Amino acid sequence: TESYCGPCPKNWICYKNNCYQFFDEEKNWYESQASCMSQNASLLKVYSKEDQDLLKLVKSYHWMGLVHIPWQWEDGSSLSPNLLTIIEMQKGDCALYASSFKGYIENCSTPNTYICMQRTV
Amino acid sequence: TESYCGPCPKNWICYKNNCYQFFDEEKNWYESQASCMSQNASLLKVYSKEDQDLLKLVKSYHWMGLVHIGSWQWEDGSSLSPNLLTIIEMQKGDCALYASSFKGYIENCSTPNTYICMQRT
Ligand SMILES: CN(C)C(=O)[C@@H](NC(=O)c1ccccc1-c1ccc(C(F)(F)F)cc1)c1cccc(N2CC(CC(F)(F)F)C2)c1
Numbered sequence A: 001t002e003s004y005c006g007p008c009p010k011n012w013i014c015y016k017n018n019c020y021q022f023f024d025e026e027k028n029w030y031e032s033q034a035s036c037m038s039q040n041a042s043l044l045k046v047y048s049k050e051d052q053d054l055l056k057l058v059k060s061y062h063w064m065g066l067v068h069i070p071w072q073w074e075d076g077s078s079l080s081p082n083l084l085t086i087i088e089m090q091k092g093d094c095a096l097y098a099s100s101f102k103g104y105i106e107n108c109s110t111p112n113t114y115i116c117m118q119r120t121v
Numbered sequence B: 001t002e003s004y005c006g007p008c009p010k011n012w013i014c015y016k017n018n019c020y021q022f023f024d025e026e027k028n029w030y031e032s033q034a035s036c037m038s039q040n041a042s043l044l045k046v047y048s049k050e051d052q053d054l055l056k057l058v059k060s061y062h063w064m065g066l067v068h069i070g071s072w073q074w075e076d077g078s079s080l081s082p083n084l085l086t087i088i089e090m091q092k093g094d095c096a097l098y099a100s101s102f103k104g105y106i107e108n109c110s111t112p113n114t115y116i117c118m119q120r121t
Helices: A029-038 A053-057 B029-038 B053-057
Strands: A002-009 A013-015 A018-027 A062-067 A085-088 A094-098 A102-106 A112-118 B002-009 B013-015 B018-027 B061-068 B072-074 B086-089 B095-099 B103-107 B113-120
Touching: A002 A013, A002 A018, A018 A029, A029 A062, A029 A112, B002 B013, B002 B018, B018 B029, B029 B061, B029 B113, B061 B103
Parallel strands: A062 A112, A085 A102, B061 B113, B086 B103
Antiparallel strands: A002 B002, A013 A018, A013 B013, A018 A112, A062 A094, A094 A102, B013 B018, B018 B113, B061 B072, B061 B095, B095 B103
């Protein structure tokens, strides 16, 4: 069964109506979030294994919008249970997405590649 | 700017109105083409570095619809457009794998590989 996907910027990938782009110019977590925001987007938010199952194929390690206030997303929403396996790597309050549905804890100041995500409406 | 992409099946990636799905189960070229056909699709066709620029982000190597039976040709009978793929000899064979960035590996058609299906309209 066919359907349209989006809306999305023409240069971003669309999957199940969410829009994704990969950025290989490395930035710390804050600068990555600011970059996504400048594109009317935010860092990757993981909210559904079913709607975001393409993330199983996303390799390497990329900033996502998950933060620990001493885990929650940039928008202030809570991390849903049964979504991500969180593993320590570098002492820090931020997290890198890795396959499959893993989060590696990382110092927010460490430069990394990142994934921006847009959704209209 | 924001636009809709597709149409595509709900479980496929949409990019610039083309639909892509990756298959992790290793199959030879013939079985991979049959699998794509069962989903009303074909193996990946590469026709434009601009319309398909994010093929540069694909990791590993995967069957595409390029075959030697003349020059190399696609499943649909069309010719390979010049200045699109760097063709590299890897195995004795009449089939080709896609690898980034815009490379085609000549490969034995009987070798099991992962594959990419593509649909348009
Ligand atoms: C950070 N990155 C970039 C990754 O981990 C990378 N992973 C693998 O390529 C990848 C890695 C392992 C196994 C398969 C793949 C893969 C193969 C084909 C496709 C297909 F079917 F899309 F071709 C997608 C993934 C990635 C993840 C998610 C999407 C992409 N995309 C490139 C765009 C291609 C399109 F044609 F749609 F524009 C979408 C790339």
